[PDB]
Write an enzyme that holds these catalytic residues in place. Sequence first.
Site, PDB file in Angstrom:
ATOM      1  N   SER A  97       0.864  -1.176   0.000  1.00 29.33           N
ATOM      2  CA  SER A  97       0.000   0.000   0.000  1.00 29.33           C
ATOM      3  C   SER A  97       0.901   1.227   0.000  1.00 29.33           C
ATOM      4  O   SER A  97       1.538   1.534   1.013  1.00 29.33           O
ATOM      5  CB  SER A  97      -0.936   0.000   1.205  1.00 29.33           C
ATOM      6  OG  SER A  97      -1.581   1.252   1.346  1.00 29.33           O
ATOM      7  N   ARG A  98       0.952   1.931  -1.132  1.00 29.68           N
ATOM      8  CA  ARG A  98       1.914   3.018  -1.274  1.00 29.68           C
ATOM      9  C   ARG A  98       1.535   4.224  -0.425  1.00 29.68           C
ATOM     10  O   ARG A  98       2.422   4.932   0.066  1.00 29.68           O
ATOM     11  CB  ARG A  98       2.052   3.398  -2.749  1.00 29.68           C
ATOM     12  CG  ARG A  98       2.533   2.237  -3.611  1.00 29.68           C
ATOM     13  CD  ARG A  98       2.294   2.462  -5.094  1.00 29.68           C
ATOM     14  NE  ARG A  98       3.270   3.373  -5.679  1.00 29.68           N
ATOM     15  CZ  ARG A  98       3.083   4.674  -5.863  1.00 29.68           C
ATOM     16  NH1 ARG A  98       1.953   5.267  -5.522  1.00 29.68           N
ATOM     17  NH2 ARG A  98       4.056   5.399  -6.404  1.00 29.68           N
TER      18      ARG A  98
END
Lengths: 53, 483, 128, 484, 468, 235
Positions: C119-120
Site C-alpha cells: 500500500s503506497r
Amino acid sequence: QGYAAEISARRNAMDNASKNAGDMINRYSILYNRTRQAVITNELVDIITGASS
Amino acid sequence: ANLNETGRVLAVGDGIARVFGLNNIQAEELVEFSSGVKGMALNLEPGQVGIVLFGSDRLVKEGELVKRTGNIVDVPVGPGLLGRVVDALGNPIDGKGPIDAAGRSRAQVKAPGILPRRSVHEPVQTGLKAVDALVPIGRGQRELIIGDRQTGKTAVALDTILNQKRWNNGSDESKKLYCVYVAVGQKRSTVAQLVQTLEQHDAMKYSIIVAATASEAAPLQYLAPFTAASIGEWFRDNGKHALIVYDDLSKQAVAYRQLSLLLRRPPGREAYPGDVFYLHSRLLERAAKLSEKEGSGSLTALPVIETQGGDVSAYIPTNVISITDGQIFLEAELFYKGIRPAINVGLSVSRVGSAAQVKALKQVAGSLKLFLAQYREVAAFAQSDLDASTKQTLVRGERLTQLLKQNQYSPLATEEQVPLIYAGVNGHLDGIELSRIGEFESSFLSYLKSNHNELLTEIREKGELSKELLASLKSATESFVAT
Amino acid sequence: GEWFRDNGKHALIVYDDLSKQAVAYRQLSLLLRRPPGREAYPGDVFYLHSRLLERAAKLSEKEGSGSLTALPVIETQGGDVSAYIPTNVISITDGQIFLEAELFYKGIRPAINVGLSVSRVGSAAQVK
Amino acid sequence: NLNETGRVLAVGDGIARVFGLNNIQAEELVEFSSGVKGMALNLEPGQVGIVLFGSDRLVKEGELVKRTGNIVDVPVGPGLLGRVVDALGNPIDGKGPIDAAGRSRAQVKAPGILPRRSVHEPVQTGLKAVDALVPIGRGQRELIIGDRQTGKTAVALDTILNQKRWNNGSDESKKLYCVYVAVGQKRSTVAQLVQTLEQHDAMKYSIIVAATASEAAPLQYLAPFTAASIGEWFRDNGKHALIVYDDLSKQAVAYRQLSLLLRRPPGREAYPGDVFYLHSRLLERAAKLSEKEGSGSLTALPVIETQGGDVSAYIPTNVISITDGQIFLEAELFYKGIRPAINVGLSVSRVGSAAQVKALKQVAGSLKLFLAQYREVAAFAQFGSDLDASTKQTLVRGERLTQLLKQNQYSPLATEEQVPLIYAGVNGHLDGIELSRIGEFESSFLSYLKSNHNELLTEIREKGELSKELLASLKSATESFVAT
Amino acid sequence: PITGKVTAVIGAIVDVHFEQSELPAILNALEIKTPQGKLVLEVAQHLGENTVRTIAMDGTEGLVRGEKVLDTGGPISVPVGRETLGRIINVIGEPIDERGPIKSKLRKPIHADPPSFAEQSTSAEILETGIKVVDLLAPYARGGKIGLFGGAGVGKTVFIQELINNIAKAHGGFSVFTGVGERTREGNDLYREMKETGVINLEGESKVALVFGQMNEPPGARARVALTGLTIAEYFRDEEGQDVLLFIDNIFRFTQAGSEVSALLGRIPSAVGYQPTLATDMGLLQERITTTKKGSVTSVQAVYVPADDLTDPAPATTFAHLDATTVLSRGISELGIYPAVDPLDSKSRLLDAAVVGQEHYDVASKVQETLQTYKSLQDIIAILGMDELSEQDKLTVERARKIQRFLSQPFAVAEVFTGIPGKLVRLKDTVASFKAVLEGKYDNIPEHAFYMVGGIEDVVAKAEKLAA
Amino acid sequence: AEYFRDEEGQDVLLFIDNIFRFTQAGSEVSALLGRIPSAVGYQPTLATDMGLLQERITTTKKGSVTSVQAVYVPADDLTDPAPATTFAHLDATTVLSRGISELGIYPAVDPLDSKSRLLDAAVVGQEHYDVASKVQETLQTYKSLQDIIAILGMDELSEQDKLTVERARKIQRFLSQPFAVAEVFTGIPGKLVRLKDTVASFKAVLEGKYDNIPEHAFYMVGGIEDVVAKAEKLA
Ligand SMILES: Nc1ncnc2c1ncn2[C@@H]1O[C@H](COP(=O)(O)OP(=O)(O)OP(=O)(O)O)[C@@H](O)[C@H]1O
Ligand SMILES: Nc1ncnc2c1ncn2[C@@H]1O[C@H](COP(=O)(O)OP(=O)(O)OP(=O)(O)O)[C@@H](O)[C@H]1O
Ligand SMILES: [Mg+2]
Ligand SMILES: [Mg+2]
C-alpha cells in the site's frame, strides 16, 4: 579430517552450483523477454489481419 | 490540361499525400509542394498519385499545387562535398554555403554486376591491433560492426576513419581513402560533437557527413544511406577509393517499418515488411571493388547494427549478417570488464580473410586467431587442476589480450602493430608483468623508433619480413625484453 | 458513490471485477469495428480504467471533506500479472492486495501474499 | 444464356471470378472453355468464385464457362485396388483404365448415431509398442502426430504392410483393405512408397490417392474426402478398410490458400474460421457399423506434423480434440535409439483395452505400470543422487522394457510373436540379461519358440487367448530359454 | 501484335490496359522500350475491364502512366543447349558475361509442367562428398535432392563451394549453378575459381552453365531466375539425356521474393506475412526439380532460415521436398565446430542398413546415441559439472566431446580465412575412424587432437605434436 | 430441461458434454460472419454467449435444474479463454489432471484445483470441513516438498516432514477409486463410497491410525475397511 574436507568441498560445490544457476537464470530471463515480445507481436499481427479484410 | 505537369493535393496524413493530376510523372520522381517541401512519387494509380513526404506533413495542406521536378530522386556528388555536412538530400546543413557538385546521381541504382568486379586484394588499415590482426578488412569489403548499445561500435568506425590521415596527407590517389559517415536516427547533438571530434583530429578535410537525425521525418532516415552510397559511388566509379559507414542500418530499418506500416503494408516477422531484406541488400551490394577495365576504384562499407540483448539471431541482425562479408561482434561482457575495443574474436570473422591482410601482419600474426580462440576455450574450464601446459596457455592468452587493448582515438600503424604482435606471439611477453603491458608497448615502440628506425621503415616499405628482417626484429625484441 | 463523496459523506465502492468490464468494452469496440490493440482490446483501454478509478479521491475541507474509496478486483489467469489489463490497473491504483492460490491451499486464508502486497499510501492511513 | 453458362470476369492465383451461372449449385463442378475444370465455392449476388483444378494460364478474362450439374464425385469399387489415382480418381500409375462399382460424392454425411456399433475388433499393426500400449480398433480414429522426420509415415506404412497375413486368407472378415492418401508430398516420395509396397507385395490390397505438391490447392484439399468416399465403399459393403491421411496439416494449408484467395475472413494463424469443421466432418466418417448394416468398418489414421513439438498450435489442437487417441512420435527418443520412437507417456488410445488381442492384453496389462514408474525413477536417477535398491530394480526393469520395444522398419511382428516377448519382459525374466543383448535375446528367443514350442505359437494365434495351461507352458519355455 | 498502356505503377507491380478485344494470357512476357533497353513484365493476373496486372523483371523507376506495352506472345523464354555452357545468363535469358550473343538453336519458356507420376525414377545410390559429417550421418544420394539449412553467418556459402569443388569437377555430366538472391561477390568468386580450374573454358569446351539473379535484383527477377536455371537443367536432363548437377543458392530467396510482391498483388497475408500461395509456388518450382526416366538430376539447394527459426513457414515447407538435409546451426558454430552441421538434425533417407551397410548404419546410430546422451546431460554438466556424473556418463560425455570435435573438418575453400589447409576424407576412412573412436581405442588421446583433422591418422599425428 | 423445470415443477438434471464445443462453434460462426476475431481467435461475444447459455440453467422458485458440464481444456491450458470464461459460472469444479493420471491415480481429479462453493462448515459441518482442509494442507505440503525430494530424496527431510510426506502419499493414493464404468479399463469390481464413510476414513488416515499400513493398500480401494482388507491380503 575426511569429514571436514568433505563438508568444505560440498560447501564450495554448492557455491559453484549457485553461480551456474544464476547464470542460467540470466540467460533464460533474456529468452523469456524475447519470447514474450514475439508472442505479443504475432498475436497482434493475427488480429490486424483479421480486422483489415 | 495543366494537370500534366502539376497536380492538386487530394489528401494528407501519416506522412503520405494523395495528389490528383501529375499525369506525366515518372515513378519515384521528386515533386515539390507549394510550401517548398519535397516528396517522392511512390505509387502511381489511375487518377491519383501517392507522394511520400520528405518532411513534416504540417507543411502540406489539401488543395495545394504540386509540381514535377522531372528528375528521379538524386543528390549532388563530386569532390566538393569533402568536409561538408549534408542532409539526406544533399543540402548543406553545416552552414558553410552551397555545395559544389561534379554532377548528380540517383539515390537508387543497381549495384555493379558479376563481371565488373574484382577480388578484394587491398587492406583498409584500421589502426586497431585487434581488427587488423584477427579480422582484417579489405578495400571493397562490406564488414558488419554489430553489438549492444554503448559497446564501442562508433568508436571502432571512427578510429578506422581517423587512421587514414597518414595516407590522405600523401600524394598517391591509389592509397587515399575517402570516408563517408552516415548518421541515421542519431541525436543531432551527437552528430555535431562527432563533426567537432573529426575537425580536432583534422580528419574532416577528407571526410563527408550525411545526417538524418532522430527528429527528421522517417522518409529522410530511410533515404539517407542510399544517397550517401551514391556519394561514395562517385569515388568508386572515378577510380578513387572510398569508405562508407552506416550508423545505423537498424534505425533505417525502423524508419522503413514506419513508412511501410503507415502505408498499411502487411507486417511480417517482428512487424517488419518482407521487403526489409531488399532494403539492405540493394544498398550493401553497392560496396564493391571494380576491375582494371573499370579503373580499379572501390567502395568499402562498415554497417553498424545494434542488437537488443545481444541477439545476433534476431531478424534484422541476421538479415545484415547474410548480406555482409564478415562481422566484428562487440561484446558487452568484455566491454564492461575494460576489455576494449572488446572484439569477440570467436564470433568475429572476415570472410575475405588473409587476401586483404598485409603480408607482414599475416607473417607475425600467424595462428593468433586460433590461439585466442583456444585460450577462450581453456580459460572457460579453468574456473580439474591446471596442467603446466594450460598454465602456459593462460599466461599467453592473458598477455596477448592485454596487448590487444587500445585507447580510443589512438590509431597504430602497421609498422607499429608488427613488432608488438611479434613479441606477443613469439612469447617474449611471458615473463613481463601484465599490469605493465600498457607500459611495455609505450617503451618498446619508443625503443624501436630510437634504436631501430631502419627496421620500421623496411616493414613499412616492403610490406614483408625477409628472414634477415625477421631476425633483426627478433634481435631487437630480445634486446628490449632483456633491458 | 460520488453523491456521498460530494455531500461530505464517506463511501466505499468495490468493482467486482474490472477484467470483465474490460472484456465487455472489448466486445463493444470489436463489434463496432474500432481498431484493435494488444490482446484485441481497443487502443485506449487504459483510458477506461483510468477514467473510472481516478474518481476515487479525498476532498479538502473547502470542497466538503468527503471521500470515495475504491477496491477494484482483478483476476489474473495463471497468476500472470504481466497481462495487459492487470498491468494497466496495477499502474493506475495506489497499491495491491495480492492473493495467491498456493497460500490458500496451505490453509493460510485469506491467503494474502505479504511480499507482493504493498500500500503506497501505507502507514499514513493506519490506525495509530 | 447466363442460366447455364457464364463469362469469366477475373483470373488470378488459381481463382476465377465468373459472371452469370445463375442456376449453379454451391460447390458444383464447372468447366471452362479451355478445358480446365473448377469448383464453384462462392455464390454471391453477382459473381461465382470458382477454384481451379489446374493452371490459370489456360483461363483468361472473357472466356465462356459451362455448368455441369455434377457435384464433385469419384469412382469407387474394388477395381481400384492396386491402382494409384489422383484426387478425382483418374489413374496416374500409367496402367489401363479403372473399373468402378459406382460413383460416390466427395462430401458425404457421416454415419449417424443409430447405425454404428461399439468398436471391438483390433487393427493389428505389428508394432510392439502400438499393439501393446496404444491399441487401435477397427473403426477407431487414431492420430499419429509428431515433428518432421520422426517416423510417422513409417508407423503407418508398417501398419499397412502387416496386413499381409490376413489379406492372403479366405476369411473376408479378417482382411483389411488399405487406402493411403498422400497430400502435399512430392511425387518421387509416392513413387518410393509404391516401390516399397510392391517390393513387399502389399500393393495388391492397397489404394493410393495422390494429391502431390504441384497439384492445385483444390485437389490437395479434396483428396482426403474422395479417399474417404473410396474407403466407404468397403465400409458399406461389409468389408474392412484402413485409411491413412498423410497428412492433414497440408490439407489445412491448402484450405487456407483457397479461403484466403477467395477473401473469406481469416481466423487464428490466418486459417479460415471453420477448419475444425473440415477435419471433423472428414474424420467422423470412420465408423464400425452394426450387424444390420453389414458390420463393415473404416479405420482412420490421420497424420499431423507439429512444429517444434508445439501441440498448442491451432490444427494440431483441433485434430487431437477430434481423434480417439494419439501416437506421439518424438525426435529425442528417436536419437536415443528408440524406434519407432513412440512417446509411450503422451500416447493414449481411448478405445484401448476394448480393442486389443486378449492374450496381448493379458500379458501387457502390467507394462504400462512399469514404464510409468520407470519414467519418474529415471528422471530422479539422472541427477546421480543415491538410490534405494527397489528403485534401482525399477530402473533395471524399465531400461530393459524400453530396449525390448525397439523394432526395425518394415519388420512387423505377428501377435503370436509379440505375446512371448512382452511376457518375458513383464515377468522379469529379462532382468538377468545384459541390457545390450536384449535385441539379440528377442531375435534368438523367437527362433527358439518357433522350433521347440511351435504348438504354443499355433495355439496363441488360433485361440487369441492365453488359458492357464498356455500361460504355464509359456512360463516354462521362457525360463527354459533364459537358462540357456 | 497486341499492345496496351501502363495505367498503374506500384513497387514492382505494373497494371496494363489492353483496349484491344484480346488480352495476353497469364505468365506472358510484355516489353516496354526504355532508354536502358527494354523492361520485361510478366502477366500475373487479369483484373477485369481489360486490365492485367504484371510483375516487372527490372526497376520500374522512370515508368510513366501511358507507356506503350507490347506483348511478346509467349512466356519468358531462355536459351537452352550446349551453347549456354560456360556462360552467365540473365533472368530473362541474356548473356551478361559480355562475350556476345548466345547462338543456341532453341529457346524454351521458363514455365513448364512438372513430370508426371509415371515419369519418376527412384535412385538409391550414395554420393560421396568427402565430408565426414555428411558421409557418416546423412549420406547424399546421387540423382536425389539435397538441402542445406542454415541461418546467417553459419557458412552456407563455404559449404556449397566445398561441395562444388568436390563433386562438380568429377561429375562428368553438365552442371548448372543458379544464384538466387546471393552475394554478387561470391558469384564473381565462383566464376573466377571455375575459370582458373578449367570448369569454365573461354577457348573451348565448358561443363557448367551459370544463371545469376543475385540479391541486388528486384523481387520480380529473384522470383523467376530459379525457373531459368531449371529450364536449362531440364534441357540437359530430357533432351541431351545427360546426368546433371543443379546447385541453387539460395532457394529461400525465391519464396521471400514472392512475399515481397504478394501484398501488392492484393492477396490476404498468410501467417507471418507470407503469401497464401507459398505451398503451391514451392511445389511448382520444386518437384519440377526431379530425376526422371529420361535423365538424372542431382540438386543441391541452400535454404536460408530467417532469424534461425527452423519453424518459419518457408523452411518448414521446404523440408518436405528433400531426400537429404544438412542443418547448419549457430549453436555449433559458436563452439568453433565448423562446418557447423548439426549432427542430430541432419537427415537422409539413404542412412538405411540396406544402403549404407550394417556396419556404417551401426556406427552412425551409435554416434548419434552418444551425442544425444551428451546433449541431454548438458543441464547437469552446466550446473553441477562433470564431477557428479556416473563413471559411465563421464566416459560417454568424453567420447561425445571427442566425436563433436572429430566431426569438424577444414575445407580448402575456407583456407583463405581459416588458415588451415583443406582436407578430404573418404567414406570408408570416415566410417573406420568413427568405429575406432566408439570402440574406445583412442580414449587416451586428448580431445584437442581431434579438432580440425582429416581422419584418425591425422588425429594420431596431431596428438604426437601436442606431446611435443 | 427448462420445460421440465417451469411447466412441470420437476427437479431436473441437465448433463452437458461438451461446453467447449459450444464455445468453439460460436467462434466458428463468428469468424464466418466476419466479426473481428478476439484473443486467440475467439469471438468477441464469448462472455455474453456463455452467460446467455449458462444462467438460463438456474434454480427458480418453481424447480431446480442441476447440471453437470464436461469441459475440454485445449492443450491442458486452463488459462485459455474458453475454460477461463466457463469457470466463472460453476458452483463445483472437478478439474481432471494429466499429471495425477500419469501417477496412475484414477479418477485423476486434482485434489487442490478442484473447488466447491459448498465446502463450508455451515453446509457440510465442521468435521467434514476439518478433514478436507487437513487433506488439502497435507497434499500441498507434500507438493511443496517434492521440489526438494526430487534432488535430495526423503532422507534429508525432518522426521515431521517425513511423516507428513508419507501420510500425504497414503492420502493421495487413497483418493483413487474403482469406477464400475472402468471395468473395461480395469478388472477391479467397481465400488461406491458414502460421504460419511469417506470423512471417517480420511480422518482415520490423517490421525495416523493407519501409519502401519503400506502405501499400496490405499490404491484403488473403497473405504478404509478395504484398506485394512487389502493390507491383510498383501501380508
Ligand atoms: N577503445 C576504447 N577505449 C576506451 N574507452 C572506449 C573505447 N571505445 C569506446 N570507449 C568508451 O565507450 C563509450 C561509447 O563508445 P561509442 O560511442 O563508440 O559506442 P557505441 O556502441 O557507438 O554507442 P551508441 O550505441 O550509444 O551509439 C565512449 O564514450 C568511450 O567512453
Ligand atoms: N523403426 C525404425 N527403425 C529405424 N529407422 C526408422 C524407423 N522408423 C523410421 N525410420 C527412419 O526414420 C526416418 C524418418 O522416417 P519417415 O519417413 O517414416 O518419417 P516421417 O515422420 O513420415 O517424415 P516426414 O515428415 O519427412 O514425412 C527415415 O530414415 C526412416 O527410415
Ligand atoms: Mg554509436
Ligand atoms: Mg512422412
